[PDB]
Design an enzyme around this catalytic site. Structure first.
Site, mmCIF file in Angstrom:
data_model
loop_
_atom_site.group_PDB
_atom_site.id
_atom_site.type_symbol
_atom_site.label_atom_id
_atom_site.label_comp_id
_atom_site.label_asym_id
_atom_site.label_seq_id
_atom_site.Cartn_x
_atom_site.Cartn_y
_atom_site.Cartn_z
ATOM 1 C CG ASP C 227 -2.086 -0.977 0.777
ATOM 2 O OD1 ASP C 227 -2.900 -1.584 2.179
ATOM 3 O OD2 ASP C 227 -2.551 -1.408 -0.201
ATOM 4 C CD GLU C 269 -2.778 2.180 -2.782
ATOM 5 O OE1 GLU C 269 -3.585 2.395 -3.498
ATOM 6 O OE2 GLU C 269 -2.014 3.316 -2.568
#
Ligand SMILES: [Ca+2]
Ligand SMILES: [Ca+2]
Ligand SMILES: [Ca+2]
Lengths: 546, 546, 570
Positions: C227, C269
């Site tokens: 992320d 991501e």
């Protein structure tokens, strides 16, 4: 097979009590019914264990924990015998088989066992006057009149017989004789045309019925209410009600019961004024030699009238007016006024909890044995959509979840949907939501029940209605005869507003009232009017101590 | 346009009170707040008229019939000013505009009019200490420090200033200084980083705020609670709370109010012990020259403790310990213990109605002006799923139908769904189901309210706590000075069980207690201990008559 | 103790993978992620085994039979690390401990063991750009700048630095520098103030972080979505996104993973246009030396536009402009337009021709920011739910199903993170605990609520959305062409219909045909299937044989929002 009754070749064969397993019996107690609090519960309505949308015997067995916790002494079951169900199961097709929908006879034995193991007794209705068209005896009577079952029912070539005898169901029936298609003769029925009356003049009919009693008692049941007993016998030139032959048969049924199954109970279903109903207790000199119990019908409407008038007199009067009963006898009392022949408690009082609690205090402190109707303990309601008898017969409201926690089956397969009434529905009133709130209706009645059990004076004590200056307040003492005997005082405010009372308790001078709910000592009684004070529809229970 | 505040060219322009229609005023009454019962209601939660899922001003106007029927004297509204809503509307973006979601200022005028026409007054919160980052003054302060709004907020080049002053929101904030990105300087905030404090040392700031007050009062509002007033001023080397400069400003705000808008009310938001909070009433010699009202916080937790201990002393003590207040002053009292900083009444008492009713009797008979929170009258609950402040802020439960009768909009467009809690949800507890049941929580509080109105002694009478032998029972008299003056007696049972009490009422010998709910005369007072008796958590109200 | 992370006495000490039981790994398959259907599930929302009111890892273990039955190949979990939960658990306070609410590291090992024995894999999020304010590393960095953790975060004496970088959350934040009260220095944050950015310029931070990966991989996990990766490195004079140093670090991570734990997956991501995201796959010459997977965001908005416009053009165009990807890589596809680390739909002024068009359509405008579940998004229209699911399951890439979409669950507003609806009974069969103590109340929506839509009800009835989704999933598994086949759009006389072929290279290679009607009305289409003369279409769902393909254009007929799947057999 054990389950079912079968006709062959011309004789109706029935299984005996020996054919099934005997449930564990409870120690013999002749006067248990005097101390018992009864709980009337419809099998179809309580709990569905088989997951088919209709409550069953197996479902009841599961809920015995709940009943014992609540603290009831005997379970009373409406008829569960095999039936076409044209009249809610009161039209019996077979006396020797449980309606398949509710389970088998083995399931009933497992109920009588499980309940006994919890110290809880079982009684059921047993329809006496009539059977269903569907019953094999009638099917044999109409086919072979010269056969053994030909004289089992009342037959006549004419309809002009037993006049002056009233027609009960005036709305539906037009005569007490019905023309049978097969036998081409008239037959007698005080109830519905599909419910032909037994001919009790026939000695074989008497014995067959005493055998039906013998059967269920052998299985282990603690007693019956005997249904439609005022209509058993009929004689020309009378109203065919309450005849001497009827009473004499019941006396004989008692003699058998006491001999073969000692310690059981016999209740009489009779919708009539006390003093007329008192006949069914039998001869007073014997100490009672007929039915142990009959119901006191005018009590509840008198309690209601007292609350609307805010005056004790309607209640004190019917009690003073109630005829005395034999020793081995008790009045059955309940918060309803219709049998067959309704509403339920909570909706009748516009959901006023204090008023419900007052009525419940009265029920549990007045002379007799109280009968609670399943769901009264949580203030359930009725449904108009169904009308009268089917409207009160709605499923038990356990939870606010799917099906009210009564069944896991798909809603639609249910016999009746739980009420979604905005006030009395299962989302508004249910067992789960009330089990934890200390002052819930549910926990209130459990408390009173518990308290009542520690005081025999409520069950078998004498009744002395005291007098106060205040007409709105009903006070009375329940006392067991003998020095150092149980003595309780009950003060009830029938007014919707707070009231003062002066009571003449000189009879118990120097006694100390101890409030039963919290064991708080109150001022001792002197030679002086004893002053108490109550809010609208409040009540006090005291033990008078020495 | 009248709706909104606009910046041009370097000065923030705001509409004056004259720009809107003036609502009908209510006859001048200096001490109305002494007799008033307050009803705190969240606009977003009450009723949705525009059908958008969030309650509005127009929705409130509709429900004034209900409030008047219930019998409340003043409506109290949490902040409804224009805001980004980073802190529930306490972060004010514009003082001169209603949050568009709730309606316009014209809708507010229509509320103040409709409510006045029903004899019901309106008061609102007015955040004093701080505004939002979003407020134009701050946006001007950070852009042009040499502009007129440059000194509107507290600015510093360093963070090592005003130490020893506590950080309020310890969980979120780490310092009372925040580094502004644009102006490249630190600014002061006792609350959130997006809520910069006003600089009250600036005379322009004072006047601007007095003008904000002047605005809403001109529209016709009956008063304010002044929010975060303990934090207005700050001085180096102190804790920056309750400073003399703060009190002096409030005294001046009062002087303006009394002169320009006579008969309005000023309440102080201060979460502190009485005796510390008593400062905000001002100088006693003037008869009160600061705020008219402050809240009594420890009362409710003392009532709770009294019920758990089953002892009057926790209650009688804080009252005896409460400092005396000036004539033109009143304690605001309510059944809660948290402000900013919660639960609701019913779930706190495990849904015990008698206990709720007891707490409510106390609320309405103890010294001060009671404040009911919307939905307490029907025993609504809280929701944990939301946590604290958002958990109590659920929509009003009118009916058991779709959206609880609060909105006609599609469920999903709602700001918050009504609680489907198995006990406190809208299907279980709602206005519709309780309006008809005479003993409902809803009809109980309406009755007490009605009764309280006929007796000024509850509002402005003296307080004499009597003494009984029984520690479980709290009894007291409320008496208006002067011969043939209103005199009421209140007896409250803190025990969960029935209790007897002897009261020394010699002070009112030959007086006759008349119970207020049903006007029943009780035995007259003699030279003798006066005996009363109560069930668990019961209470009596009497007028002592001559 | 084995559970937790502790600072003793100036050094933050953490447990190793060897301290716990090792979960049994599956046979090493380096290309499994290409053939996988992912199932994304909130731990809190699925099943409550501890009866605490919150969903837990033990609860997820009980529900594996269901997931296996449904036929998903890999479970994907949002962050479950120890966290103060100021931002949905994406604010990590401890990488080495499971959030107590969900259980412990030992529960997680058991989950990987139970999942693998059923043939199901586990991946989770791993926030890489920042830790929580409450993280021991930040508390030491702010307290002792002279200590080992002093340079773990980005500290400056001025806010006037890196001024070319945008603010991601413009509403909550006004600067990417927050002034710390204790250390008295500005620190850098790309997200929220309570989420300080790690200093990846520090060699110790890198090694520390790849150790975190080593930890969970060693436990048994099959992968992460890494992320906030576009924001790892900062440099003066740049916009601080997508810097070469950021990519270089990721290449080192892939290097370690491949070496030490062969056969796992790494997902990037990045809320970016495809063409910008393609960089995160790494150097194509390698076969891919960075992330294996990245999400294709404009797909579903274009599908949505296609349905409203009743024209295949918006779908055709994004497939046509999708850059080719390295041999060992896959697009992730899902029915949403942005992820949880941003507020708004991923778009692009320059490269998206529908850029201004999404707003002009009312139904689409209400879906730019708000995240909805599939059924509500399409007004509970069964035909369209089935159409979008067919698209998601047949277009190129690895599909990700969101938990509850398979029974057609809805949202709430205050809300896609509501409890899983198992049964129509108490708590929706989610928990045995009191309704008041549950983390959130099970949706009682008259149309989307647990009484109307739940697993139990749908599992039985053969016509259910659950049984549709299961059939589709089962059909797709029998055909590798869906997962790794080529994409060839077909010539057709009707732009209302989107038709394409998926083909595995080689003789006897798996060949499927998909035909999709974007119109709400019945439509005829003549397809140019000459490339497959003599091939016979067999409809996949009922194995019905359709007419042999000739040289003449091939005619099919569909009702509004219908679709067909065929195998082209020889
Ligand atoms: Ca008869
Ligand atoms: Ca200030
Ligand atoms: Ca970074």
């Amino acid at each position: 097979p054990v389950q079912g009754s079968h006709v062959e070749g011309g004789v109706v064969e029935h299984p005996d009590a020996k054919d099934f397993g005997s449930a564990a019996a409870l120690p013999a107690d002749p006067t248990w019914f005097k101390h018992a609090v009864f709980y009337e519960v419809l099998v179809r309505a309580f709990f569905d264990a088989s997951a088919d949308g209709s409550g069953d015997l197996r479902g009841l067995i599961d809920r015995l924990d709940y009943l014992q916790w609540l603290g009831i002494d005997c379970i009373w079951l409406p008829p569960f015998y095999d039936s076409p169900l044209r009249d809610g199961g009161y039209d019996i097709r077979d006396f020797y088989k449980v309606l398949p929908e509710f389970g088998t006879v083995d399931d009933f034995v497992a109920l009588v066992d499980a309940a006994h193991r919890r110290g809880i007794r079982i009684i059921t209705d047993l329809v006496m006057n009539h059977t269903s068209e569907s019953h094999p005896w009638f099917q044999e009577s109409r086919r072979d009149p010269d056969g053994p079952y030909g004289d089992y029912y009342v037959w006549s070539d004419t309809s002009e017989r037993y006049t002056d005898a009233r027609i009960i169901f005036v709305d539906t029936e037009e005569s007490n004789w019905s023309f049978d298609p097969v036998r081409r003769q008239f037959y007698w029925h005080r109830f519905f045309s599909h419910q032909p009356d037994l001919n009790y003049d026939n000695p074989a009919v008497q014995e067959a019925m005493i055998d039906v009693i013998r059967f269920w008692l052998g299985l282990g049941i603690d007693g019956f209410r005997l249904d439609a007993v005022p209509y058993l016998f009929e004689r020309e030139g009378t109203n065919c009600e309450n005849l001497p032959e009827t009473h004499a048969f019941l006396k004989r049924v008692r003699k058998v019961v006491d001999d073969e199954f000692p310690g059981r109970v016999l209740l009489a279903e009779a919708n009539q004024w006390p003093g007329d109903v008192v006949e069914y207790f039998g001869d007073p000199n014997t100490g009672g030699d007929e039915c142990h119990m009959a119901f006191h019908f005018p009590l509840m409407p008198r309690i209601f009238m007292a609350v609307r008038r805010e005056s004790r007199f309607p209640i004190s009067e019917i009690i003073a007016q109630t005829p005395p009963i034999p020793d081995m006898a008790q009045w059955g009392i309940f918060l309803r006024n219709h049998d067959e022949l309704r509403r339920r408690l909570a909706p009748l009082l516009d959901n006023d909890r204090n008023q419900i609690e007052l009525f419940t205090a009265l029920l549990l402190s007045l002379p007799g044995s109280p009968v609670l109707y399943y769901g009264d303990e949580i203030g359930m309601g009725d449904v108009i959509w169904l009308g009268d008898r089917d409207g009160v017969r709605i499923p038990m409201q356990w939870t606010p979840d799917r099906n009210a926690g009564f069944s896991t089956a798909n809603p639609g397969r249910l016999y009746l949907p739980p009420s979604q009434d905005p006030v009395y529905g299962y989302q508004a009133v249910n067992v789960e939501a009330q089990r934890d709130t200390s002052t819930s209706l549910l926990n209130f009645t459990r408390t009173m029940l518990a308290v009542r059990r520690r005081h025999p004076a409520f069950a078998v004590g004498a009744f002395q209605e005291l007098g106060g200056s205040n007409p709105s307040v009903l006070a009375y003492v329940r006392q067991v005869a003998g020095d150092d005997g149980d003595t309780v005082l009950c003060v009830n405010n029938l007014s919707r507003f707070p009231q003062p009372i002066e009571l003449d308790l000189q009879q118990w001078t120097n006694y100390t009232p101890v409030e039963l709910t919290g064991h708080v000592e109150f001022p001792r009684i002197g030679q002086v009017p004893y002053l108490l004070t109550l809010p609208g529809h409040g009540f006090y229970w005291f033990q008078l101590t020495t």
